[PDB]
Amino acid sequence: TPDIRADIHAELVRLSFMPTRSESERYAIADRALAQYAALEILWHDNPDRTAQYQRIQVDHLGALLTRDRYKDVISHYQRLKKTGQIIPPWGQYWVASAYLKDHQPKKAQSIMTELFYHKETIAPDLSDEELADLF
Amino acid sequence: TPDIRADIHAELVRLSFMPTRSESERYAIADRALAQYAALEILWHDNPDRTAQYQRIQVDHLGALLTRDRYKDVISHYQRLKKTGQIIPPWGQYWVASAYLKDHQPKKAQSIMTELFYHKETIAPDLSDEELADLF
Amino acid sequence: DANLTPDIRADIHAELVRLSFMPTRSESERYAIADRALAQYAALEILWHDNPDRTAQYQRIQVDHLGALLTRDRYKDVISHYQRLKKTGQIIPPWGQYWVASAYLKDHQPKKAQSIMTELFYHK
Amino acid sequence: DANLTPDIRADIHAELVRLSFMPTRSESERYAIADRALAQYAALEILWHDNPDRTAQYQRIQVDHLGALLTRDRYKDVISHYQRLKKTGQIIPPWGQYWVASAYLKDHQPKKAQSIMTELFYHK
Ligand SMILES: [Cl-]
Ligand SMILES: [Cl-]
Ligand SMILES: [Mg+2]
Ligand SMILES: [Mg+2]
Ligand SMILES: [Mg+2]
């Protein structure tokens, strides 16, 4: 049930990115999601049993804020999510880049896109647990 | 002055890693640092003007906890530092690995050492700010 | 033991493509390293085309090739190669989609670049 | 334009060493790719030794060589190469120190491995 409430929030945020929709309509659907959010924020804040779908709406919230052209809020919500050590999925980083750009702040948008597309190669000497141990 | 107080804390934590020193002595010097910490934690908690040297003692604290063989506390302090989105320097990760290992939990120690030694290569199409913009 | 050598040859192709994206480097240097990879490709293209035992290695270089084309500013070729790889129904990894978007954009074709980036971040 | 080719040859050496550390791979595969790099090295060793214009590229392969030796389980050689590179006063990057520690450890010499790791995390 909390899953489907987060699912509904997510759907609304996605419906907000319709270019088929005008500014009036976009803004109105962004609001339906901003509101569903405000409610669930409060309902779920102090609850370890709803920790999962809390984190989801936290990110989907970046979409709604951006859709309603509240650029500085997307950044401040991002920065607030950062300081909870929560991992922003890539699509969430796409949103905050868009925002950083529209706030006349492109260098930050670039650094986000850079950190999104790299290649990583380990240099881990295959060590046994007993060999890693003999190192401490 | 806060710099030199953090400097003193750091020095104590380093003096705790002397193998030249016995268990009694090690434990005693770990305590001098655990205490200096407890004080500075409180003195500095709600202070944006001391945010820098706060973060330093936060990490140096992992050393003292580990030196006094309080393995589970090093992990719980680490995990608490994680959820503040604070960046643990490599030497701090070395400490928490040692702890994860001594808590009979080696797979986590390995994953830390792995994430410490990699190679990273960007795949960033060099895009202009005006071209990154034309993408949003 | 038999996929080891071709694996490393595809691995070296990939590395060259990635070395071409180092922004520290000028146009002449970029172009030179892009060429080393465009060439490694042209060779392996021929060596492998009709070979089921290197079908995996073939497909890798096919995508890594998008990078080299883009790095050497051959935008229109990146798109034609993309569209050709699309019609073989093989997956373009995300980094590959980012590449073809950059190309679509530099070919003065931005609405199609957005459409690519849309499909690139889809989680439903 | 003249450091470009030697740069890419050192770059390819490095990549091979790194491909050797992929833990997905068996002993036979690891050993085979370690050899491709040990060989690339032996060639460049000779080609470059007495050449001030490739002194940079020379020094790179010198460190990357620690990886290949270690990957092929030639522990005692990693240490002797380390100690030889040490006496030329050139910096071993951190990842290089991690390598020689692993070697010192596998040569049943753990107290020296700790001493290396000590110097590896020093910030005072
Ligand atoms: Cl082509
Ligand atoms: Cl040798
Ligand atoms: Mg690489
Ligand atoms: Mg690649
Ligand atoms: Mg390397």
The major sheet of chain A is characterized as: none
As a percent range, the share of strand residues of chain A is under 5%
The CATH architecture classification of chain A is Alpha Horseshoe
Sketch the topology of chain A as an H/E string, one letter per element: HHHHHHEH
CATH superfamily of chain A: Tetratricopeptide repeat domain
Output the number of helix runs of chain A.
7
Provide the list of bound ligands, each named once. chloride ion, magnesium ion
Helix content of chain A: 55-70%
Largest interface: A-B, 26 and 26 residues
Protein name (chains C, D): Poly-beta-1,6-N-acetyl-D-glucosamine export protein
Organism (chains C, D): Escherichia coli (strain K12)
Subcellular location (chains C, D): Cell outer membrane
Structure in words:
- With 136 residues, chain A is mainly α.
- The first copy, chain A, has one domain (2-133): Serine Threonine Protein Phosphatase 5, Tetratricopeptide repeat (Alpha Horseshoe).
- Helices cover 70% and strands 4% of the residues of chain A.
- In chain A, helix 1 packs parallel to helix 3.
- Chain A is globular, with a radius of gyration of 19 Å.
- The termini of chain A are far apart.
- Strand 1 (118-122) of chain A pairs antiparallel with strand 1 (118-122) of chain B, so a sheet runs across the interface.
- It is classed as structural protein.
- The entry lists the keywords PNAG binding module, tetra-trico repeat (TPR) domain, PNAG secretion, structural protein.
- The assembly is tetrameric.
- The entry is titled "Crystal structure of the PNAG binding module PgaA-TPR 220-359".
